[PDB]
């Protein structure tokens, strides 16, 4: 949640909006321009990617801060998971705060910073040729200077298995190919240069 | 996306200018940073270290990026100026100056910062592993009674690479199958003790 309690002393500078259990909290592109400090309760922020798709992002426990003070590249769609109470902070209430006490400036920074740390700490190609070498070096059965693996394993499945976005499972499988490194010809995997796999892996 | 915050160029005087010839550690490893660093010319690779001396690259930073931090963060940072680079350092006591001189910046950063979380979160799951085995099984599995038996190495680590998966999970996940009863990975042997429920969960 990365709660920022300190701020509950400060909600009276806010717009308190209570929401029922399911009622959409940020719309999928209702335009949102304020920090939504979440005081009792819980919220599910998913992103709607621009295809139409769905995909979780992160929950918001009590005390957490969600929202934003800007248009910020993405469509959020967040549901109240349980009858939840929230205090909205416009920039101008937000201002009003900092004037009433600096420390909170930092307070949010901290909270943001942390959040950066966090997600950025977590954050392809090799995860691929790792999967392949794995297979080649177990299932590998020599055919002259290449090695054959008698298994379908289709683009979709490398994606799934590698947690890798298709355009990449393509480009790279394309590139493994173009290199006399690897054919996944329909049924069977033919590895032309194993030393070069191991090494890129 | 060196999420530059050009506005900050206007207040470097409230800051601390620290210059950094190429190759030079802008962030030593486990040296403690309590200042926003503001990149006023140049280019840094930030790396991290996992608590297991592992290294991998955190971001770049470019003309007008803000890296650095005002607090502890339980991350292990190693920045080096690729190019010769002018920085400028924001202690709190100093940003605390800037925000009085100029209360607007408080939002120009909050934006700034608020935005990378977008970014990152947007980029950013047990699924895979199973799935990894699942294909691995359906293709290689040699059914020994109710079990399906492949002969491979699968170093806990390789899985964590293959699958963009944190070691705790890989670990805490071979934990949850070998238990559950699904899968045992015991040395040079896969031994799936339930393909049906294996694909239910995938």
Numbering used by the authors:
A (entry chain B): 19 to 141, 149 to 226
B (entry chain A): 18 to 141, 149 to 226
What does the paper say about this structure?
Crystals of the oxidized, ligand-free wild-type CprK were difficult to obtain and only yielded data to low resolution (to 3.2 Å) using microfocus beamlines. Nevertheless, the relative position of the individual domains could be unambiguously determined and is roughly identical for the three individual dimers present in the asymmetric unit. It thus appears that considerable flexibility in the DNA-binding domain positions, and presumably in the entire molecule as a consequence, is lost upon oxidization, confirming the previously observed effect of limited proteolysis as detected by mass spectrometry. In case of CprK, oxidation leads to severe constraints on the position of the DNA-binding domains and hence a reduction in overall flexibility. Furthermore, while it does appear to not significantly affect ligand binding mode (13–14 and this work), it prohibits formation of the appropriate inter-domain contact network that establishes the DNA-binding form, thus inactivating transcription under aerobic conditions. However, the Cys-11 and Cys-200 residues of opposite monomers, respectively, part of each of these mobile structural elements, are likely to be in close proximity for most of the time. This explains the marked susceptibility of CprK for inactivation by oxygen through formation of the intermolecular Cys-11–Cys-200 disulphide bridges. Inactivation of CprK under aerobic conditions through Cys-11–Cys-200 disulphide bond formation is readily observed in vitro, although it remains unclear whether this process has physiological relevance.
The transcriptional regulator CprK from Desulfitobacterium spp. induces expression of halorespiratory genes upon binding of o-chlorophenol ligands and is reversibly inactivated by oxygen through disulphide bond formation. The CprK associated with the o-chlorophenolacetic acid (OCPA) reductive dehalogenase (CprAB) from D. dehalogenans and the closely related D. hafniense has been shown to bind OCPA with μM affinity leading to sequence-specific DNA-binding, and ultimately transcriptional activation of the associated cpr gene cluster. Members of this family are homodimeric and contain an N-terminal sensor domain linked via a long α-helix (involved in formation of the dimer interface) to the C-terminal helix–turn–helix (HTH) DNA-binding domain.
